[PDB]
Design a protein around this ligand. Sequence first.
Ligand SMILES: Nc1ncnc2c1ncn2[C@@H]1O[C@H](CSCC[C@H](N)C(=O)O)[C@@H](O)[C@H]1O
Ligand SMILES: Nc1ncnc2c1ncn2[C@@H]1O[C@H](CSCC[C@H](N)C(=O)O)[C@@H](O)[C@H]1O
Ligand SMILES: C[n+]1c(N)cc[nH]c1=O
Ligand SMILES: C[n+]1c(N)cc[nH]c1=O
Lengths: 291, 291
Amino acid sequence: MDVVSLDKPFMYFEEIDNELDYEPESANEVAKKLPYQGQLKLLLGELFFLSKLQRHGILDGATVVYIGSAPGTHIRYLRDHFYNLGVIIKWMLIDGRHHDPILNGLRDVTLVTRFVDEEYLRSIKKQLHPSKIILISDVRSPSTADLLSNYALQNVMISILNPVASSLKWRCPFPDQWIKDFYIPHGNKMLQPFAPSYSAEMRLLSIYTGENMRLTRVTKSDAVNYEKKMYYLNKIVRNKVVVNFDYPNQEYDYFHMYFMLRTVYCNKTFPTTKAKVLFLQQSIFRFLNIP
Amino acid sequence: MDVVSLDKPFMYFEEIDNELDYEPESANEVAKKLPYQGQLKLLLGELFFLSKLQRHGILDGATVVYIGSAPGTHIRYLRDHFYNLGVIIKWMLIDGRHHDPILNGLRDVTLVTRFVDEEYLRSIKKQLHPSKIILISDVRSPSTADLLSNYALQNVMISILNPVASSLKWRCPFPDQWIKDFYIPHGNKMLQPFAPSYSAEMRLLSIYTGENMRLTRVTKSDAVNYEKKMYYLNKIVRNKVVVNFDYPNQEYDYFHMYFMLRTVYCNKTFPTTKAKVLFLQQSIFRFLNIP
Ligand SMILES: Nc1ncnc2c1ncn2[C@@H]1O[C@H](CSCC[C@H](N)C(=O)O)[C@@H](O)[C@H]1O
Ligand SMILES: Nc1ncnc2c1ncn2[C@@H]1O[C@H](CSCC[C@H](N)C(=O)O)[C@@H](O)[C@H]1O
Ligand SMILES: C[n+]1c(N)cc[nH]c1=O
Ligand SMILES: C[n+]1c(N)cc[nH]c1=O
């Protein structure tokens, strides 16, 4: 067995303290181990992000604009969670594909069937005005060309929507497929437990203070770094059993999940963090039909 | 006569401490009082900016890429000034119009006859590599549509060229001609002595630290503010005679010029700042053929 002792998991990209030459053979390996693992991956990250905004007092009264929301099964859990906590939030879910019918019939959630373009963004901004907007983007076209285009669309979402905060899908193009340097919003590169086995994808989390917008350039050397750091995380770290992690499941991803869940707020009071987390996890897995 | 006592002039936009409702009638008033006033306006601002970079040790060894450089008569003075000071700089002047022939025959200055587009910017960047680039932009198409387009081109200059510093032409669209909010690089809004009588134009000066790029949104309310602050500056301030300004010319613009010139470095040592400034001014006016 692959056992180890860890104080805390790698929460953000910058924390990864080692790297490994990427082995293309890893692409042929089992990408997922749990049913609806993708819904779980998203639910944890979005719960983490939104709980932070709550902590900073910027969630209540906002409209969450989620672009690339379909099917969005897990979004129903998110909605119920904050709705039951007493937080007042309107949800606007936009995607050209159809949403899970469990999202229908809720006065607080609007489902829109539209692929957004710059022009459309302008009209929703005018229509949402004067509400404060929290943006969540999970759009997907892939080629580096598709990526750059998705990233360019994401930056235009922020400029036009002018959100108080945002969570954006972020996966750096692979070095051997570099095209050109580009900019992405400045934010924390949140790491994702339950991401596919060898996924280099993370979520860019940003909070907008003032009327400024900070961006950061991304170069091929950065792309080389992302590949090696993420490969080391996937191949070595995520394959560890944290034996000093007293929890029903000691695998790295549950240890990582634990740390995200411990930040989440609840109505019910627990005698320990372990009690809260086990409850949240149980609740999440049951909702998603994960054994 | 319109007399007053001033400690220092308004150096940057933020310093303007009052505002006045814009009177459209002012557009019919004499815009310029000195021959080649436009060359003088540019020469002072660019000398100010470049002396700052020298002060910060980032000028020597750079290539100044000036886009919208033609005719560029005043650029010959700038070049001679730093060339005689011992600073090693290469100049690359690009414009689709022809440059003043006084710029020819200098190994350190390259004249290019080309209207730059994003594609061209990429090729010059690849060709200038690995030199550090200082960008100066004075491109002009006008309508708010022309402006936005010029500003969008300027942001692309910075992203592609990735300069260590930049000086950009900056005039906010007029409120009654607003189209949409937009972003411009973060920088100091340098005020310009000898700008046309009622001009609302300034120069955005930026120094790039790290691999970040900070932008700032500009709204119609900001456009309303620019109009009133600049109108107050033009109508009231610039029309003042600074009687406690012991100098051959006590008009506001000479008082303002004085402060810019006092920052400029020289080979010759002077017993007073007044002596240095009078010398620099004399030298500048003689070069430009201004009585
Ligand atoms: N311009 C655009 N506007 C809206 N949705 C877009 C888009 N481009 C792509 N998409 C959507 O991006 C989605 C990627 S998969 C998204 C999964 C979803 N976040 C979940 O929770 O299940 C697809 O449904 C696709 O239709
Ligand atoms: N894309 C572009 N590339 C280069 N020059 C451009 C341009 N668009 C406009 N211009 C130039 O912008 C200039 C505006 S006037 C510039 C005056 C010059 N800075 C001086 O010192 O005299 C014109 O010469 C025009 O040809
Ligand atoms: C995950 N990954 C791939 N799938 C291909 C290249 N490099 C990489 O890190
Ligand atoms: C200078 N100016 C104009 N020329 C027109 C409108 N508002 C303004 O400040």
